[PDB]
Amino acid sequence: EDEKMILSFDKAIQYMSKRKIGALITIERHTGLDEYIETGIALDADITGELLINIFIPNTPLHDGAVIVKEGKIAVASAYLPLSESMLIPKEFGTRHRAAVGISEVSDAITIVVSEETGDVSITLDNELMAGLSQQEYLAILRRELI
Amino acid sequence: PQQEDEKMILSFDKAIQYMSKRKIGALITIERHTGLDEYIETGIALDADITGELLINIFIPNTPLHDGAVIVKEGKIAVASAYLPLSESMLIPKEFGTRHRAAVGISEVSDAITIVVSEETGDVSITLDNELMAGLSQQEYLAILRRELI
């Protein structure tokens, strides 16, 4: 039932992709994101699509940094992630994409970005940034990498 | 201690200040001795740490979470968008609003403390023991929350 979380992610992502609402969600796997989690605002909150949409409503106190998911919970919102210095990044991509890449360099975390500019959905994992994702594409990557 | 109870109050105050100034409607019910589980089961489970920032994000108008009541239970936002009973008091006009009737409603049926910000005015009210304290100062609502939550 790690699927319930994936369908909650799916609700949130569909809503924000269509409306070009920027979103940054890192999911902890084996590498502890402890030192990054303690830079954010504590939520320790149950995962629902509704909560994820509300966090990322633009011009709100929680929309800016990273949501970090750990166990079954939203641990924090507005967490600071390491920003990638990689010169291999296509530059059309913003701070959310540099956060996504930068946390993938130091961990095995899986990060979802919704572009604030285009509503383009991205997953980052193992330095690989996978932009331009459709619904069935992001749902399969997430299911594959989280069961 | 009171150190964490003072932190809860500081979270409410930040939320109240932000929404009052923007005329953002808000309803926050704080469980004390009366169980509110029958009302909590009607909402969307958050089970979240209390922060001013989360409370602001919850109540942004026309958002999934902004409607109904946040219920706080044992230092946790248990739910958003929860049902509370509407007061049917002979003392209350039709021209009172939904959140104000809910606030009066829950204070008739529980020792809960309810904060409401008027979406029409930004006026801050607290209901407690069948009593509605209307158009509160920051200093007033701080003093009421300090005396009842601590």
User: Are B48 and A46 a contacting pair at CB < 8 A?
Assistant: yes
Domain count, chain B: 1
Q: Check if the beta carbon of residue A69 is closer than 8 Å to that of residue A109.
A: no
* B60 contacts on A by Cβ (under 8 Å): 54, 57, 60
* A43 contacts on B by Cβ (under 8 Å): 48-49, 51, 54
CA distance A130 to A141: 10
Q: Give the structural domain span for B35.
A: 3-149
User: Are A78 and B53 a contacting pair at CB < 8 A?
Assistant: yes
SS3 call for B26: strand
Token reading at A123: 């997953």
End-to-end CA distance of chain B: 9
CA distance A78 to A102: 16
B→A interface, C-beta within 8 Å: 44-49, 51-54, 56-58, 60, 63-66, 77, 80-81
CA B132 to chain centre: 12
Token reading at B31: 């469980």
User: Are B53 and A61 a contacting pair at CB < 8 A?
Assistant: yes
Token reading at A106: 């130091």
Burial of A68 (0-12, 13-18, 19+ CB in 10 A): buried
Token reading at B149: 């939550």
* B46 contacts on A by Cβ (under 8 Å): 45-46, 48, 51
Q: Check if the beta carbon of residue B23 is closer than 8 Å to that of residue B119.
A: yes
CATH code where residue A91 lies: 3.40.1700.10
Elucidated via = X-ray
